[PDB]
């Protein structure tokens, strides 16, 4: 067999559909959605109709049953158009992943099945105002009371928080402070219409402005025991396990934004003249473009490797964290270099690059910060070492 | 003789006044001005009343007669509060500089003197839609017709463009395409109320949102010959010469923003706990803060050196471009590191750091981009060896 | 089909053979060869015996007929042991490549066939004292005189220069100064025993000290017309074309050195204690190692991509230059970080890391400098937009 | 009062003497000393005769009584010639500093006075095979036995280790493992001819090859109580205090090396032509040179600031560690950039730049590693914000 860097024919078809959608539908309206902060309902509904959403849902639940490699290639194309739109769409896959990997047949048919019938959204609730990077520090409480659990806590920065039909929620189920992380938490599926759920205001962030991000308070929220993933205490492994499939998709989003910044900068450098030459003819500008192209290519291969590893049935933690760390860093470098190449125009809102700079910063923060990715890569590298 | 890194007592007093003003008056309202994009008239008027504006105006024009070193120390304090507010105030010094260095007695008394009597603004017009870095590429035309020049052209990105009482304007006066840059341009003082001037829209930029930045159109604008700086063809040297005094001030602005980012990140890192420890206790975070402190200290000394050089009566081109290049780069690095240290909160508009990231990017672009600063440093550096 | 990051079974067997050879035979003697600068004849002979040399030689010439991907995986394992030894071995592939890609059957059987029978070395001569990066600037002359060419010129920095059985030589064949690069040069195969070939001293470089690097002068050297690759004027395309297959192999060498630096630093960090903890327990050290691991992994995939592209029958210029630029940079960053992690011991010659720092620098210079790789990437990138 | 970046007339005279010596005497022989590793006795003796060595010794001990600023300006000029030669000379100041700052009149007259009479060397012994960065981890024992201390332990990497007339030595005097660092150690002046001191082989390092660096064993070495600096347990503060005056001098050494790399690269770039132009005309090369010039200028001001701080009577820990961290980093960047600009010639030993790359690495390691400098700067910075 051997190495191959060629997509299958089906993958080329998915890529073509996602690219056409991003170019014809997302790009022409993304600046307006970023200005208004309006949730991009028409684009989400069109992505759903084109089969570009909920791609991991198994075929037996009415889904496409695609793998992580397929989700990444779609995600890169959507992100090229807008990561605000792509984050809303990807948010569904983040909420669904714990059910896909740890749900029983009933939970999958009920909660994933509904997503294949209508363009509903879902969300995942882990982060709290007091703890984000430190998942083992979460304080939202889950207490078993007969055939149900009572949830009390506050979650923060929830993507699709105000639009979700249901949430994946991680809560502390063991009151013992000495309980190890792998036994202390429970993962739940929570219907959004449950009494006691209080959704907060839309948060106003620097970037991905059309994505919906909110705080949510859970006050004595009743959850049936049938909505527990695996069982009491299995929450940490379910939530951590879901990153193997989602982290390469997030890295692909950063790559799409980076590719957009590179394309905008190159096209501008081929039109703008200074000192009697096109910008591409000034060696400092050509060297920047060369370095930007090197970074995009290497970041793309990093997510492709992480996606192929998990699709091959292997744990991909090391590769997925390398991809998230590297793609997150280079999306930020490319976005500021693209603003730089456009000069005064680059700093201006009528040009498309300043939005990319505002959007890119989230890739060093959400879904495991740059520092957390380094902590993971360090642990995996040190564990792999042998004389 | 001998090195010294201690301010004079008068300089400590100016620093204290500017610091108190930035911390008590600018900081509490800067987020609201960034949200609305409203021109910060009350703050500008208060800075003017406190003697923090137009500092280079000579004492014989009713000014304070301070030097570049004094302007920088004030600029750093104001920028710490908000670079949108500081850029509006600094814009006056950018417009005034060609008059201070090249104006005759009448031009200085008339145009600088009025600034000491009322909190008027001024602006400088060099950049055009077609040329910014390439000053020798400007196409705004100045045609001599008797005792006046007729100006035709469009200028772009002018700080205080819609608020200025008058402009410094650079225009091409030699129609011959083979005319060298040192003979082809003429610098003018142009009153903003002159018929034929059309002030454009407020440009909506990523950062420094409360600063007024506008395109300005000149259609058959009549300028008296008495408003020419030095003479026909001296424009390029006047405009280039003005950077010696303004470039260290722009670098000081970047330093103030960088110091603000460092302070916000350090204070947050002493309050936020993760994995059972304050962020400062995680070595990666302490190393980040140490590197950020190193960069701010070095960038501050870079502008101090460039300012002292010009105040000492030496050309400071090499030091001023090192300061602008380095301070511009580190303000950007520090602003993104401060957003990083605050995490999710850092990305949010209720915290002060994302504004710093949006504001910082202009320091790599305006008043000579990062690339242009490197071209200047290389030329000055290489000149020492040949 | 679809993507795959799994080697073939045959590739896993080659990797195992090369790894065992590097770890058991190269590593224990590499420090001694670096100290003496002795040409590593016993290791070269063992690599030849094991089938780890001249891997691109076609099966019809008695060779293994392996592709670029196979050559890269072997190169990475050898380089991990020592890039001085790996450069001597790789030097054979550099000299053979123009014959592999552009030789006729006679040239291939004669010159490649002899390499499969005995562990002979060969070399490639392009660089001159006056031109290295600028291949179109070469001045070595080739004058056609009946059925032979007369070569006159000086070549510089030739790997295996004093050990080669034959050379690939690029010379200017068109004396017209207006002749374009694609018509001005001719590529030749030159027997090393030809009268007129004068070998210089062994150059003493900072790193890869056991590799043989020498200047070579050709004084009225007679080369038969049957030794011309393709024909008069085809030299530039032959020499440029050879980089498609060799550049990923050079990048793989840089990755091997980088992997060795990472492994030596990690082993040390798992043994050395400071402040009551192993070095790995200090977050700054663990962050370092994480970044070093990220860089090695990405650099490895970059050469694997470039090697697969050319093996699949596509021009790989863009991917090959990305790989050489990135792997060359990271080998240098990793080697200095490894010296850093070992502290005082790292700076000392009894530890293995200072040799890695000295060896790594060549990867930013030979086989197309870091700057030249960026010029190539820029040209290939921009070409996609028109 | 008011800032000034102008040297005094006396400082311009010292600079001129040191520059003439480095350019006429050090530069022409530095490559030979680097090749042979021979200790540069003729250059050290000439530096001593010119008044360029032991500059901090007070005038009442027969010394020049110069400050840290004066020592830095001299150090930069010598380092430009060769940091191997400059480290041997600076080694004297490292050994003398604890006596200058903490010695009593008798100790200063005896140990410093002898250095003003003959070009003797001295050295400082803190580092051990088991601990370098972690000074509080040193295990060399000093057992008080009446009127003397018995020393047992091994020191490693001692500059001028085999050439010293006497050593400053730091040893653990409190056997209690719970003793805090500020009470556990004692600093001594130890005559090199004391029975029980065994000097190891010359260590062969990558760079500064002509500098003498050795391991030293102290086996039942008797040190009189009159040779104790301050008293029992004051060792840690004496050793740490000495860095305030020595750290800016080490940073000045890195700056001299960096300035040499920049000069060699610029001169070459003005002569070498490629693709029809001088290297300076290729924008990537001019941008490199501009960035190298920026770094050298900033690193020079960082040590000048740290030196002025201590000379003005202030603790300069924060500025000195910024200078050592920054100058150490930029000497390494400039040396590799100078090798790069020279191309194949740069990698070759007949050109002067590869020696600079090998020499530069020590500036990130000795006299407090890059990491240790960051730990110091972090502590100094962060503590200012605690209320
Ligand atoms: C727009 C947006 C959308 C998001 N979407 C979701 C979502 O849908 N669901 C959800 O559950 N969460 C979501 N999050 C939360 C996100 O995952 C967190 O912001 C992130 O994990 C960081 O946590 P934090 O903000 O609490 O920062 P903190 O954990 O407080 O960290 C602050 C800083 O310290 C660093 N740091 C922390 N611990 C260490 C350490 N041990 N060593 C070194 N450095 C350290 C971090 O890297 C960071 O730079 C989102 C966040 C944003 C802003
Ligand atoms: C908010 C704002 C306020 C400003 N205020 C003023 C003001 O008050 N008055 C005024 O006159 N102007 C002002 N300017 C204009 C500013 O000076 C220009 O934006 C700047 O000089 C860059 O010119 P440009 O935008 O035309 O970019 P360009 O000159 O088009 O350059 C585009 C890019 O190419 C690079 N580049 C250009 N030439 C070269 C070269 N030879 N080699 C290598 N790289 C090169 C640049 O560095 C940049 O990255 C302001 C700009 C902004 C955005
Ligand atoms: C140990 C060793 C082994 C080698 N082996 C071989 C071999 O076997 N055969 C052989 O033919 N050659 C070989 N070489 C030569 C090698 O390829 C050259 O050293 C290299 O191509 C650079 O050429 P140069 O040294 O002439 O540097 P130059 O071309 O003089 O370049 C000097 C510097 O300027 C930069 N530069 C040059 N032109 C530009 C430009 N247009 N824009 C921007 N930057 C530019 C370069 O990147 C470099 O940093 C070897 C070299 C070494 C040191
Ligand atoms: C040529 C030479 C001359 C010298 N001259 C002298 C001399 O005259 N006298 C003398 O006493 N010593 C001298 N030294 C010793 C020098 O000071 C030490 O090498 C240096 O202090 C580092 O200590 P170490 O080598 O034990 O490294 P270690 O302390 O083992 O550290 C190894 C690595 O880990 C890092 N590290 C260590 N602790 C931490 C931490 N807490 N957090 C993060 N990173 C950490 C270090 O920065 C380094 O990268 C010299 C060294 C050399 C090589």
Q: Do D282 and A282 touch (CB under 8 A)?
A: no
- CB-CB contact of C328 with C215 (8 Å): no
Buried (b) or exposed (e) across A174-190, using 16+ Cβ within 10 A? beeeeeebeebbbbbbb
Residue C312, token pair as written in the block: 């699949």
* Contacts of residue D249, Cβ cutoff 8 Å, sequence gap at least 6: D68, D71, D72, D75, D90, D93, D303, D307
Sign of CA dihedral C347, C349, C351, C353: positive
Q: CA D254, CA C112: separation in Å to the nearest integer?
A: 51
Cβ of B124 closer than 6 Å to ligand 2, yes or no, is yes
Q: Which residues of C touch D126 (CB under 8 A)?
A: none
Q: Which of B347, B357, B376 has the most A C-beta neighbours within 10 Å, making it the best mutation to test the interface with A?
A: B347
* Contacts of residue D30, Cβ cutoff 8 Å, sequence gap at least 6: D81, D82, D84, D85, D210, D355
Q: Do B322 and D297 touch (CB under 8 A)?
A: yes
Q: Ligand 4: which residue has its CA nearest to atom 33?
A: C341
Q: CA D85, CA C103: separation in Å to the nearest integer?
A: 55
Cβ of B216 closer than 6 Å to ligand 2, yes or no, is no
Cβ of D349 closer than 6 Å to ligand 3, yes or no, is no
Tell me how far CA of residue C60 lies from CA of A9, B375, C63, C103, C114, in angstroms. 36, 56, 7, 13, 12
How close is the nearest chain B Cα to the Cα of D191, in Å? 38
Q: Under the phi-then-psi rule, with left for phi > 0, alpha for psi from -120 to 50, and beta for the rest, what region is C172?
A: beta
The 3-state secondary structure of chain B, one letter per residue: CCCECCCCHHHHHHHHHHHHHHHHHHHHHHHHHHHHCCCCHHHHHHHHHCCCCCCCCCHHHCCCCCCHHHHHHHHHHHHHHCHHHHHHHHHHHHHHHHHHHHCCHHHHHHHHHHHHHCCCEEEEECCECCECCCHHHCCCEEEEECCEEEEEEEEEEEECCCCEEEEEEEEECCCCCCCCHHHHEEEEEEECCCCCEEEEEECCECCCCCCCEEEEEEEEEEEEHHHECCCCCCHHHHHHHHHHHHHHHHHHHHHHHHHHHHHHHHHHHCCCEECCEEHHHCHHHHHHHHHHHHHHHHHHHHHHHHHHHHHCCCCCHHHHHHHHHHHHHHHHHHHHHHHHHHHHHHHECCCCHHHHHHHHHHHHCCCCCHHHHHHHHHHHHHHCCC
Phi–psi pair at D13, nearest 5 degrees: -65, -45
The 3-state secondary structure of C13-25, one letter per residue: HHHHHHHHHHHHH
How close is the nearest chain B Cα to the Cα of A281, in Å? 14
Q: CA D24, CA B50: separation in Å to the nearest integer?
A: 57
Using CB atoms, pick whichever of B157, B207, B347 lies closest to residue A344. B157
Place of tokens 């170019």: A23
Nearest residue to A324 (alpha-carbon basis) of A292, A354, A295, A299: A299
To test the ligand 3 pocket, which listed residue (C243, C369, C379) has its Cβ within 8 A of the most ligand atoms?
A: C369
In the reported structure, the alpha carbon of residue C282 is separated from the centroid of ligand 1 by a whole-number distance in angstroms of 22
Cβ of C159 closer than 6 Å to ligand 3, yes or no, is yes
A382 touches chain C (CB under 8 A): yes
- CB-CB contact of D93 with D75 (8 Å): no
Chain B residue with minimum CA distance to A354:
B206
- CB-CB contact of C244 with C320 (8 Å): yes
Calculate the CA dihedral of residues C347, C349, C355, C358 and round it to 10 degrees. Answer: 60
Q: CA B130, CA B155: separation in Å to the nearest integer?
A: 9
Cβ of D126 closer than 6 Å to ligand 4, yes or no, is yes
Q: CA C209, CA C33: separation in Å to the nearest integer?
A: 8
Chain D contacts in chain C segment 321-340 (CB below 8 A): 332, 336, 339-340
Contacting subunits of C (3+ beta carbon pairs below 8 A): A, B, D
Q: CA B357, CA B346: separation in Å to the nearest integer?
A: 10
In the reported structure, the alpha carbon of residue C128 is separated from the centroid of ligand 3 by a whole-number distance in angstroms of 9
Q: Which residues of A touch B282 (CB under 8 A)?
A: 371
Instruction: For the beta carbon of residue B169, count every other beta carbon within 10 angstroms.
Output: 30
Q: Which atom of ligand 4 is nearest to the CA of D367?
A: 17
Q: Which residues of B touch D309 (CB under 8 A)?
A: 5
Cβ of C352 closer than 6 Å to ligand 3, yes or no, is no
- Alpha-helix residue ranges (DSSP H) falling in A50-82: 68-81
Q: Given 3-state DSSP classes, what are the helix, strand and coil percentages for chain A, each rounded to the nearest 5?
A: 55, 15, 25
A284 touches chain D (CB under 8 A): yes
D157 annotated as a binding-site residue: yes
List the determination method: X-ray
Instruction: For the beta carbon of residue C134, count every other beta carbon within 10 angstroms.
Output: 16
CA terminus-to-terminus distance, chain D: 31
Chain C contacts in chain A segment 44-103 (CB below 8 A): 69
Q: Ligand 1: which residue has its CA nearest to atom 4?
A: A157
Nearest residue to A372 (alpha-carbon basis) of C320, C286, B290, C216: C286
Beta pairing, strands C148-159 & A277-278: unpaired
Q: Do B4 and D2 touch (CB under 8 A)?
A: yes
B282 touches chain C (CB under 8 A): yes
Q: How many CB pairs under 8 A join B and D?
A: 145
B130 annotated as a binding-site residue: yes
Residue D107, token pair as written in the block: 């100790």
* Contacts of residue C113, Cβ cutoff 8 Å, sequence gap at least 6: C61, C62
Please report the DSSP string for D85-141 in residue order.
HHHHHHHHHHHHHHHHHH--HHHIIIIIHHHHHS--EEEEE--BTTBSS-GGG---E
Cβ of D140 closer than 6 Å to ligand 4, yes or no, is no
How close is the nearest chain D Cα to the Cα of C206, in Å? 6
Q: CA A96, CA A115: separation in Å to the nearest integer?
A: 9
Q: How many CB pairs under 8 A join A and B?
A: 104
Element (H, E) at D168: strand D164-172
**Which of D90, D271, D367, D380 is an active site residue?**
D367
* Contacts of residue C290, Cβ cutoff 8 Å, sequence gap at least 6: A325, A373, A374, A375, A376, A377, A378, A381
Q: CA C232, CA C187: separation in Å to the nearest integer?
A: 8
Instruction: For the beta carbon of residue C47, count every other beta carbon within 10 angstroms.
Output: 26
Using CB atoms, pick whichever of C318, C326, C375 lies closest to residue A298. C326
Using CB atoms, pick whichever of A6, A325, A378 lies closest to residue C289. A378
How close is the nearest chain D Cα to the Cα of B374, in Å? 6
Using CB atoms, pick whichever of C2, C301, C312 lies closest to residue A7. C2
Nearest residue to C328 (alpha-carbon basis) of C257, C254, C252: C254
Q: Which residue segments constitute the domains of chain C, with CATH numbers given?
A: 3-121 (1.10.540.10), 122-242 (2.40.110.10), 243-383 (1.20.140.10)
DSSP state of A60: G
Using CB atoms, pick whichever of A69, A270, A294 lies closest to residue C326. A294
B308 annotated as a binding-site residue: no
Q: Which residues of A touch B364 (CB under 8 A)?
A: 340
Q: CA C210, CA A41: separation in Å to the nearest integer?
A: 66
Place of tokens 């690069």: C181
- CB-CB contact of D122 with D166 (8 Å): yes
Question: In the annotation, is B367 catalytic?
Answer: yes
In the reported structure, the alpha carbon of residue D87 is separated from the centroid of ligand 4 by a whole-number distance in angstroms of 16
Residue C115, token pair as written in the block: 């390499």
- CB-CB contact of B81 with B17 (8 Å): no
Chain D residue with minimum CA distance to B302:
D298
Tell me how far CA of residue A69 lies from CA of A5, B4, B155, C326, in angstroms. 12, 62, 50, 25
Chain B residue with minimum CA distance to D283:
B375
B62 annotated as a binding-site residue: no
- CB-CB contact of C351 with C335 (8 Å): no
Cβ of A382 closer than 6 Å to ligand 2, yes or no, is no
Tell me how far CA of residue B284 lies from CA of A224, B280, C289, D87, D374, in angstroms. 43, 9, 13, 32, 10
A213 forms beta bridges with A159
**Which of C148, C191, C367, C380 is an active site residue?**
C367
To test the ligand 1 pocket, which listed residue (A93, A139, A369, A373) has its Cβ within 8 A of the most ligand atoms?
A: A369
Which residues have C-beta atoms less than 6 Å from ligand 1? A 123-127, 132-134, 157-159, 205, 213, 362, 365-367, 369, 371-372; B 272, 274-275, 279, 282, 284-285, 340-341, 343-344, 347
Chain D contacts in chain B segment 114-133 (CB below 8 A): none
Residue C3, token pair as written in the block: 């993507």
Q: CA A210, CA A359: separation in Å to the nearest integer?
A: 11
């Amino acid at each position: 067999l051997g190495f191959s860097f060629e997509f299958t024919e089906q993958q080329k078809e998915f890529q073509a559909t996602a690219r056409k959608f991003a170019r014809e539908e997302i790009i022409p309206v993304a600046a307006e959605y970023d200005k208004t902060g309006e949730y991009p309902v028409p684009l989400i509904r069109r992505a759903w109709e084109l089969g570009l959403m909920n791609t991991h849902i198994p075929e037996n639940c009415g889904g496409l049953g695609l793998g992580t490699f397929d989700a990444c290639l779609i995600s890169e194309e959507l992100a090229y158009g807008c990561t605000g739109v792509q984050t809303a769409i990807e948010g569904n896959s983040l909420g669904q992943m714990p059910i896909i990997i740890a749900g029983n047949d009933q939970q999958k048919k009920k909660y994933l099945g509904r997503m294949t019938e209508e363009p509903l959204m879902c969300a995942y609730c882990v982060t709290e105002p007091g703890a984000g990077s430190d998942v083992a520090g979460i304080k939202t409480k889950a207490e078993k009371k007969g055939d149900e659990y009572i949830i009390n806590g506050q979650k923060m920065w929830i993507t699709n928080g105000g639009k979700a039909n249901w949430y994946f929620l991680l809560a502390r189920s063991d009151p013992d402070p000495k309980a190890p992380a792998n036994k202390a938490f429970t993962g739940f599926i929570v219907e959004a219409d449950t009494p006691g759920i209080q959704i907060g205001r839309k948060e106003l962030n620097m970037g991905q402005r059309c994505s919906d991000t909110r705080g949510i308070v859970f006050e004595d929220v009743k959850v049936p025991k049938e909505n527990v993933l695996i069982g009491d205490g299995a929450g940490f492994k379910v939530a951590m396990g879901a990153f193997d499939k989602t982290r390469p998709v997030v890295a692909a989003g950063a790559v799409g934004l980076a590719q957009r910044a590179l394309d905008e900068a190159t096209k501008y450098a081929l039109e703008r003249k200074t000192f009697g030459k096109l910008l591409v003819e000034h060696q400092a500008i050509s060297f920047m473009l060369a370095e930007m192209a090197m970074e995009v290519e290497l970041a793309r291969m990093s997510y492709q490797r992480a996606a192929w590893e998990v699709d091959s049935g292997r744990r991909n933690t090391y590769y997925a964290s390398i991809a998230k760390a590297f793609a997150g860093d280079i999306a930020n470098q490319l976005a500021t270099d693209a603003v730089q190449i456009l000069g005064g125009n680059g700093f201006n809102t009528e040009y498309p690059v300043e939005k990319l700079m505002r959007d890119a910063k989230i890739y060093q923060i959400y879904e495991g910060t740059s520092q957390i990715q380094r902590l993971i890569v360090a642990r995996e590298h040190i564990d792999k070492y042998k004389n």
